[model samples]
Target: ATIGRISTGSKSLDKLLGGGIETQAITEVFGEFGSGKTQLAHTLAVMVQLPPEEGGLNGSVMWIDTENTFRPERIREIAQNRGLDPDEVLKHIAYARAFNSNHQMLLVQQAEDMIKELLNTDRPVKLLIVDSLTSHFRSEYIGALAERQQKLAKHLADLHRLANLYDIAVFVTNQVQANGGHILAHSATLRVYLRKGKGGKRIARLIDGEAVFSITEKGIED
Candidate 1:
């Protein structure tokens, strides 16, 4: 079987997630600006390299950064925090930045090729993270909710196959609108809500049964 759940890099978040995001499924984390979603993405990029007992699948990450939010500096910080080689950690991650809508989805096509290549190596792809998957469609498709929904559904469907076919976990970030909230609420197997907390902290509340946790420097913590 494909390796199981991998930690979000914090015990508190892992507990909140009932042992972290499950493999062979989609776990979508979304929220507003400065909500710590991308921080968790960076954390996972490092954590996924940890071995199973340490709460990871010992795999690499494929990141599709649509919002220009992928930060190497932060990944390096996290990698160092884990006492690993920063250069190696950066090497393990494959990142692609997208300029607009279709260019965004086309990156996934590239990920398909990358996944195959990784499988034969020491680090096979374990997580596919799309940071802000909805922005391009949202901005471009003011035309109609029907059209954007259709396009998003098709894209998410393709993403779902990548999850199942490769038996890897897929994590996605979504942009939230006041009117619609999160577009893929019904599409994700696991959903999380993030909001600014009282301190310099951020809060994550899970759905299907809500749970809350704080965002700390190392990742999501108690």
Candidate 2:
């Protein structure tokens, strides 16, 4: 299958990602608090709305916010900075907040209906963003390590199915500590680690490759 790529808003970063985030697969971006994981999520949320010729899928997005990190204010700023209509950009993103791990799984299941509804429209759902994928599981499954891994395996399977079956991109963020063991590590098609650099620059490490970019009002830049 041919995998579609979406730009990360940084030319060098996109190239480093072998074009950009891949569709029909899950891309995991992890790092510490000051890293650009959430920032990258916000940037992709807006970039996914652009036409295909402009490095987007010309589709809408489904964002499951787990850490109360989905900020419309920042989304608007990114859209306005990119010359897109902020209102239109916000309109295309279907946002939902998940209170717990169970709720998060339920939301991902519910997203199928939403994706189907949009499939018949001009702007289909092409990206699913689960910002900070493992926070709830990490905290809630404190004592049940084995149970957590088992549930997480199933949850990741669901996400993978959604990506392959719908032919869409799945971008998930994770904290440095909650890496979800080998289950998550093996499931993700692309895993990039974000870290701080000199001054305001950020670095993304993907196995043997690395790329440099910065986060500004205009979003990710080279």
Candidate 3:
């Protein structure tokens, strides 16, 4: 089957992402604190539920809250503001809290089963969000960089498999640190660095990144 399109919740972002988020692939967004990573994820949770013509999947969203930042109230507000049923939109979202490394890994592993169960009951999920993919792993294995990297690779592989298996769009948020050469230097199908711009405004930049897009109140734009 053909992979679905990935929407950035912004038109510019969608354009930069070659028509939004890539279906059946992992789209990683990394940045420092308050860079709008979680906000974007929350926005997508609502955006992904809109019809395809509206740049959405018109389906459910699976949100794996790793850092306990999933907020239903905020998502409801966005959905209602966008002319969607707030309660319905909120209901379509499946929230799971990942308290530690083991909980996070198990969540990824059982994702398929959960999706299957949801689909069997007539609720289908088209988007999966892993907020802060590196948080728990980084904290759990702080001094063990090698082990951390390995664990990250394994978890990401599982995520990739889930996306492909279900043909769903996977959106992941990551954390970044200075690496000498540059503050932001990493790899992913799609990477974006967000920082504080002038006037303390949050700005997202594509540094050696893929897809040119911007985040606005209206959502992601090119």
Candidate 4:
């Protein structure tokens, strides 16, 4: 049997993703600025903490915040909307801010310790989120294509290693402004492209088709 899936908190998005995000895999989501990518991350940060019956994994989150976008208040609001204790929901999440490309990769590697430590706890680590995975690399690597590719390949390898070893859902975001290169495209188990739709809605594009969802004060919704 498979490890399991983590709900996106949106029924339609869940259906589009074949019953939410899969464990033991790397799921990449790319979009332009203000396309609700960060919003989705916020929602997942809370969703991953809920009980399985409530569309969660009953696990904790390990978030690599490269852009400083992991908002606790958003998590609080989302948890409150779900009738969960916001403070408890906030407590289960482990956050780490990445300063540069090297720091980002180091954080991913260090997550192994955190995962192992929490495996037997009430809220085991189940989701690993790298918000805007390519920002540091894009800015740090400028014209150094070869070095950049090599480094990024190793970084992604570490991410896959953790996902496979711990059976966690690895979620990463990229920018549509820059290409993620072949390594990233080949490495991710599933790729989703997000775009802004009419009426303050968002459209998620996958292989089969697209799904419409919205992000509100509560969270992501159908």
Number of clashing residue pairs in every model? 0, 0, 16, 0
lDDT of 1 by residue, 21-80 (tens): 877888888888777888888888888888888887889899998888888988888788
Full-model lDDT, candidate 2:
0.88
List model 4 lDDT by residue over 138-203, tens digit each.
889888988988888899999998888888999999877554444256768899888899898899
lDDT (Cα, 0-100) at 184 in candidate 3: 17
Q: Lowest summed lDDT over 10 consecutive residues: which window, candidate 4?
A: 176-185
Estimate the TM-score of every prediction.
Answer: 0.92, 0.95, 0.86, 0.95
Candidate 3: where are CA atoms >4 Å away? 118-123, 178-187, 199-202, 207-222
Candidate 2 C-alpha lDDT tens digits along 1-222: 477888889988998888789899899988877798989999998988887677888879999999898999999999999879999999999999999999999999999999989887889898999987999998998989899888888988999999999888999988874543442667787788888999989999884267999998877888
lDDT of 3 by residue, 113-135 (tens): 87787664444778889987777
Per-model C-alpha RMSD: 1.8, 1.8, 3.1, 1.7
Per-residue lDDT, model 4, residue 55, is 83
Candidate number achieving the greatest lDDT relative to the actual structure: 2
Cα error, candidate 2, residue 122 (Å): 1.2
List runs of model 2 lying over 4 Å from the truth: 177-183
Candidate 3 versus the native: TM-score?
A: 0.86
